[PDB]
Amino acid sequence: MKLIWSEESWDDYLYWQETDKRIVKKINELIKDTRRTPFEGKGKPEPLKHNLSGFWSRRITEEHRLVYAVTDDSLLIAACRYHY
Amino acid sequence: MKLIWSEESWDDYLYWQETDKRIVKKINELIKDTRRTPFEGKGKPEPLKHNLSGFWSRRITEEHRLVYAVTDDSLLIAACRYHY
Amino acid sequence: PTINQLVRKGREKVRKKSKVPALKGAPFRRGVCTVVRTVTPKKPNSALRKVAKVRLTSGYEVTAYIPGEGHNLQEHSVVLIRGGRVKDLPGVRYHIVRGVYDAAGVKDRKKSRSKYGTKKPKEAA
Amino acid sequence: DFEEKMILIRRTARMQAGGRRFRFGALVVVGDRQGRVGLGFGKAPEVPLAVQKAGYYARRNMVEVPLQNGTIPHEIEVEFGASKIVLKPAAPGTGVIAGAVPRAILELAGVTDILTKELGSRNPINIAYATMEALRQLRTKADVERLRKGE
Amino acid sequence: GRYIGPVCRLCRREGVKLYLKGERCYSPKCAMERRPYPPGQHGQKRARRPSDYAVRLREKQKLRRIYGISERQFRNLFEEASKKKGVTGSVFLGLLESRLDNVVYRLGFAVSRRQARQLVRHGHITVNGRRVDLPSYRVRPGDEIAVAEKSRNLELIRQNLEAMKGRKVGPWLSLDVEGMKGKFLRLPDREDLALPVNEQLVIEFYSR
RNA sequence: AGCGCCGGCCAACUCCGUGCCAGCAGCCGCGGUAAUACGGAGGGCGCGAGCGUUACCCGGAUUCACUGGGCGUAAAGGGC
RNA sequence: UGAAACUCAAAGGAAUUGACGGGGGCCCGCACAAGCGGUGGAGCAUGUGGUUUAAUUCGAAGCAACGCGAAGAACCUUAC
RNA sequence: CCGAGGGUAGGGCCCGUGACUGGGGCGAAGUCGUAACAAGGUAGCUGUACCGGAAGGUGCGGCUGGAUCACCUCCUU
RNA sequence: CAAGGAGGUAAAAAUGA
Numbered sequence: 001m002k003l004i005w006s007e008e009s010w011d012d013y014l015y016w017q018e019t020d021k022r023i024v025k026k027i028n029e030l031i032k033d034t035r036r037t038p039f040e041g042k043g044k045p046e047p048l049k050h051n052l053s054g055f056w057s058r059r060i061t062e063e064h065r066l067v068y069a070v071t072d073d074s075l076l077i078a079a080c081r082y083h084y
Numbered sequence: 085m086k087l088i089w090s091e092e093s094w095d096d097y098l099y100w101q102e103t104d105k106r107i108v109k110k111i112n113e114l115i116k117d118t119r120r121t122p123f124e125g126k127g128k129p130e131p132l133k134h135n136l137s138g139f140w141s142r143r144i145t146e147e148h149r150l151v152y153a154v155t156d157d158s159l160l161i162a163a164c165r166y167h168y
Numbered sequence: 169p170t171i172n173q174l175v176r177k178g179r180e181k182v183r184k185k186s187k188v189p190a191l192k193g194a195p196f197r198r199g200v201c202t203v204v205r206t207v208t209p210k211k212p213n214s215a216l217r218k219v220a221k222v223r224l225t226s227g228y229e230v231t232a233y234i235p236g237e238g239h240n241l242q243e244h245s246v247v248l249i250r251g252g253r254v255k256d257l258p259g260v261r262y263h264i265v266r267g268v269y270d271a272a273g274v275k276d277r278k279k280s281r282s283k284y285g286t287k288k289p290k291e292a293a
Numbered sequence: 294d295f296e297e298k299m300i301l302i303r304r305t306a307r308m309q310a311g312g313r314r315f316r317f318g319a320l321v322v323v324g325d326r327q328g329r330v331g332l333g334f335g336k337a338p339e340v341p342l343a344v345q346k347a348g349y350y351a352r353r354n355m356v357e358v359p360l361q362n363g364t365i366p367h368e369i370e371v372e373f374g375a376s377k378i379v380l381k382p383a384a385p386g387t388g389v390i391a392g393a394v395p396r397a398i399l400e401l402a403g404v405t406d407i408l409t410k411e412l413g414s415r416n417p418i419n420i421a422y423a424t425m426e427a428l429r430q431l432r433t434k435a436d437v438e439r440l441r442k443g444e
Numbered sequence: 445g446r447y448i449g450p451v452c453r454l455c456r457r458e459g460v461k462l463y464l465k466g467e468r469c470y471s472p473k474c475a476m477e478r479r480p481y482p483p484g485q486h487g488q489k490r491a492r493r494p495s496d497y498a499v500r501l502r503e504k505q506k507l508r509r510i511y512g513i514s515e516r517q518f519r520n521l522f523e524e525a526s527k528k529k530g531v532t533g534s535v536f537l538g539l540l541e542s543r544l545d546n547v548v549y550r551l552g553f554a555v556s557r558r559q560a561r562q563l564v565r566h567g568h569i570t571v572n573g574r575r576v577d578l579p580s581y582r583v584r585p586g587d588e589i590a591v592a593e594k595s596r597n598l599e600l601i602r603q604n605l606e607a608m609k610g611r612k613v614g615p616w617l618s619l620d621v622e623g624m625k626g627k628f629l630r631l632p633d634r635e636d637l638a639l640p641v642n643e644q645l646v647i648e649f650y651s652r
Numbered sequence: 653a654g655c656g657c658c659g660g661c662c663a664a665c666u667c668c669g670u671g672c673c674a675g676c677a678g679c680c681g682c683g684g685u686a687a688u689a690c691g692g693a694g695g696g697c698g699c700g701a702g703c704g705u706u707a708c709c710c711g712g713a714u715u716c717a718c719u720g721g722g723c724g725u726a727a728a729g730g731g732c
Numbered sequence: 733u734g735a736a737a738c739u740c741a742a743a744g745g746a747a748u749u750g751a752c753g754g755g756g757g758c759c760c761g762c763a764c765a766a767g768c769g770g771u772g773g774a775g776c777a778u779g780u781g782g783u784u785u786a787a788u789u790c791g792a793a794g795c796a797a798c799g800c801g802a803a804g805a806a807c808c809u810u811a812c
Numbered sequence: 813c814c815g816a817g818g819g820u821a822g823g824g825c826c827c828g829u830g831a832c833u834g835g836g837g838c839g840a841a842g843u844c845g846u847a848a849c850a851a852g853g854u855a856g857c858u859g860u861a862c863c864g865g866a867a868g869g870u871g872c873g874g875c876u877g878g879a880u881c882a883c884c885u886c887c888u889u
Numbered sequence: 890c891a892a893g894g895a896g897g898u899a900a901a902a903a904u905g906a
């Protein structure tokens with residue numbers, strides 16, 4: 001499975017490094033579990049509705065969310081900061 | 085465009101993250117120059133042959149380089165460390 | 169009701185039903201594992217709980233929880249089924265006792281190690 | 294002079310636009326361990342005020358307890374709403390066999406040994422009122438013939 | 445066996461002196477004059493009000509550790525006293541006081557009940573002429589508890605007897621300091637001994 | 653000399669590590685940066701040649717009510 | 733007539749305090765209606781979003797963020 | 813003669829299993845609509861019948877577990 | 890002077906992150 005970073009995603013991933021590193025380790029933990037079972041596992045994976053429709057979200061913290069999308073061979077990340 | 089990591093790609097990008105500080109952000113400004121000027125710029129931009137069918141490389145330390153290929157609005161990363 | 173009505177029909181007694189049919193009225197029962205995996209919990213909880221499908225002696229093939237941190241269980245592991253439900257996982261009505269046939273005890277535990285089957289460590293004491 | 298024991302202190306809630314606006318209620322029981330027990334229910338916005346208000350109400354609301362050597366003269370059972378209480382006299386040397394609320398009421402009244410049982414609803418407020426009206430209904434052999442005299 | 449280990453911690457936890465060592469107890473080094481607070485890291489934190497269960501547990505544990513007895517022999521004496529004619533608590537203390545090691549402590553052959561238990565176990569104590577090396581022997585009225593004729597010339601036994609020379613024993617006991625003997629006259633009533641335990645709370649403790 | 657426990661029921665509290673992970677769990681539930689509830693340690697409580705767990709019976713359960721329950725609206729008056 | 737497996741830690745009754753109603757009774761405010769002058773269209777100023785950039789420092793986000801922190805960014809300020 | 817048992821044929825009850833199929837419950841903030849709770853914007857619920865992707869809609873009768881809380885149409889100053 | 894029983898009802902407007 002390929003990893004695709006958006007620029008909104010990549011700037012926030014590099015914002016999490018330099019500031020709060022336990023969050024980049026949680027993000028790495030969620031991506032590692034998403035890599036085996038994409039709709040099952042850690043961080044409460046639920047399907048999104050009304051605007052993210054077609055995306056999934058894993059909660060990194062109690063505020064921040066990991067919004068992703070998945071195909072047969074790829075894993076694009078929409079965000080890794082804020083509450084949508 | 086966007087960042088695309090392979091499977092060895094990010095895991096060993098995660099190896100440098102768990103191992104050393106200057107490596108990963110030096111890696112990241114190479115990513116930053118590579119998104120603006122895809123074929124020229126910092127740390128040894130070169131297309132190579134016979135191994136690589138249309139793929140490019142860049143320097144971190146002369147032991148480890150940065151192999152990548154660029155398409156329409158995409159940035160695939162093939163490797164994060166040393167040659168072969 | 170009236171007294172005549174209790175002479176006629178009488179009273180019904182409670183009819184208790186077992187929460188553990190696979191043990192078949194036994195405290196423990198030996199079984200061989202067949203699928204060892206991680207499942208995820210129910211309503212307000214999140215983890216990767218380790219369970220194992222065990223086909224055991226009474227012809228039943230049930231799922232049981234692996235308690236503790238880390239285990240040595242695979243598809244051909246002999247285990248003893250203890251008994252006891254897991255609230256957050258569906259269908260898991262049993263537990264695996266550690267420190268038995270192929271289910272070794274948890275390593276590096278020192279507080280409550282009669283449970284989880286760990287021996288007594290002796291660091292000059 | 295009077296030993297006062299608190300038993301139930303709860304936090305209630307009152308809704309208005311903005312959130313909950315709380316108030317605490319305190320049920321206390323007072324006694325002298327020599328035949329006199331009283332119980333009060335005071336509610337104030339905070340507990341020290343609540344227990345002070347409850348103690349003030351508890352010494353107003355008091356009762357006769359006709360103790361006989363260690364216990365009640367006869368067994369009594371009174372229903373207060375859905376809450377019901379059993380009192381049974383016991384021989385000397387058994388102890389106060391009661392729950393949380395009739396234990397605090399009966400030992401502050403002076404009872405040495407008694408047999409009780411809480412039936413129906415076991416809400417501490419109405420069980421306490423039930424024990425108090427049960428302690429109020431206890432009669433001795435003196436009162437029995439003084440009423441059956443006819444005069 | 446019985447409780448072996450630190451003993452000041454037991455009295456410090458119950459908050460009352462239980463006199464479980466002997467001369468160190470009436471000493472100023474008693475540690476309940478020094479530190480009258482429960483043991484542990486949280487000893488000088490402020491006492492949260494105990495429950496009704498804590499009250500009954502504390503007084504039962506207190507009475508049990510005064511006599512230094514295990515909890516099945518304690519509870520077996522308890523239902524021995526309950527399935528028994530008379531007042532359950534007063535009977536209970538009468539059966540507890542009828543233990544041989546307790547009669548040896550009370551007669552002043554020992555400084556402590558634990559020393560008394562050792563002296564009985566080691567056969568230095570004789571009951572009615574014969575040896576009884578069992579600290580749970582229920583002594584019945586009229587029995588003469590003495591010291592063995594092999595153990596009469598013992599440095600510890602005599603020093604405690606010369607320390608008991610002049611002090612009075614209880615009304616249910618007799619003592620002949622010169623003869624190294626004593627008699628269990630009667631069962632102690634509850635006015636005779638005034639230990640700091642409310643007998644009623646331990647009755648209603650075991651009444652679950 | 654060991655075993656269980658130290659959020660409440662239920663006697664017994666602090667620090668560190670972890671961080672909706674690893675895990676606990678009988679119920680309510682705890683864990684997404686100070687967690688007395690996870691893991692360890694110190695300290696404490698309960699028992700002690702034992703201490704816990706599982707399976708089953710009775711109890712609490714006046715939740716089959718003879719002692720000792722109910723049926724307008726909570727389950728319950730039969731359509732007459 | 734009339735179950736069971738399985739599942740849930742509740743499902744419920746009356747009553748209280750609120751909130752809400754395309755429920756009602758009474759009553760206010762440039763709230764509507766009556767009336768004047770505007771914005772949205774043009775050019776320019778200033779702030780914001782977006783995009784670009786080595787860097788376009790950061791914050792404010794319906795009313796109640798958007799010439800708002802700036803009641804003074806040529807190097808100073810200034811954190812990029 | 814009876815007779816253990818064996819063989820043949822026909823029934824009754826119970827159990828395991830079966831391509832497929834029907835509803836149930838759980839993991840569930842997937843998709844579609846707005847049925848009910850406020851006269852929930854057509855008062856609601858019900859028995860029955862028909863129809864409709866779906867809640868549901870409608871016919872007949874019933875119930876209050878709803879409504880005379882304003883002008884105005886039929887009878888009183 | 891004072892009330893009760895009767896009867897004609899809002900519209901077209903859905904959703905929740």
Ligand code: SF4
Pocket residue numbers: 451452453455456461462463464465466468469470473474475476
């Ligand atoms: S009285 Fe004796 S046992 Fe109690 S604390 Fe003092 S020395 Fe220790």
Ligand SMILES: [Mg+2]
Pocket residue numbers: 212213214672
């Ligand atoms: Mg959780």
Ligand SMILES: [Mg+2]
Pocket residue numbers: 372
């Ligand atoms: Mg009744």
Ligand SMILES: [Mg+2]
Pocket residue numbers: none
């Ligand atoms: Mg406690």
Ligand SMILES: [Mg+2]
Pocket residue numbers: 280
């Ligand atoms: Mg534990």
Ligand SMILES: [Mg+2]
Pocket residue numbers: 686
């Ligand atoms: Mg911490």
Ligand SMILES: [Mg+2]
Pocket residue numbers: 689
């Ligand atoms: Mg616990």
Ligand SMILES: [Mg+2]
Pocket residue numbers: none
């Ligand atoms: Mg033994």
Ligand SMILES: [Mg+2]
Pocket residue numbers: none
């Ligand atoms: Mg069990």
Ligand SMILES: [Mg+2]
Pocket residue numbers: none
């Ligand atoms: Mg019964």
Ligand SMILES: [Mg+2]
Pocket residue numbers: 717720
């Ligand atoms: Mg009956």
Ligand SMILES: [Mg+2]
Pocket residue numbers: 721722
């Ligand atoms: Mg009932």
Ligand SMILES: [Mg+2]
Pocket residue numbers: none
């Ligand atoms: Mg109903």
Ligand SMILES: [Mg+2]
Pocket residue numbers: none
């Ligand atoms: Mg009903």
Ligand SMILES: [Mg+2]
Pocket residue numbers: 729
């Ligand atoms: Mg009828």
Ligand SMILES: [Mg+2]
Pocket residue numbers: none
């Ligand atoms: Mg019929």
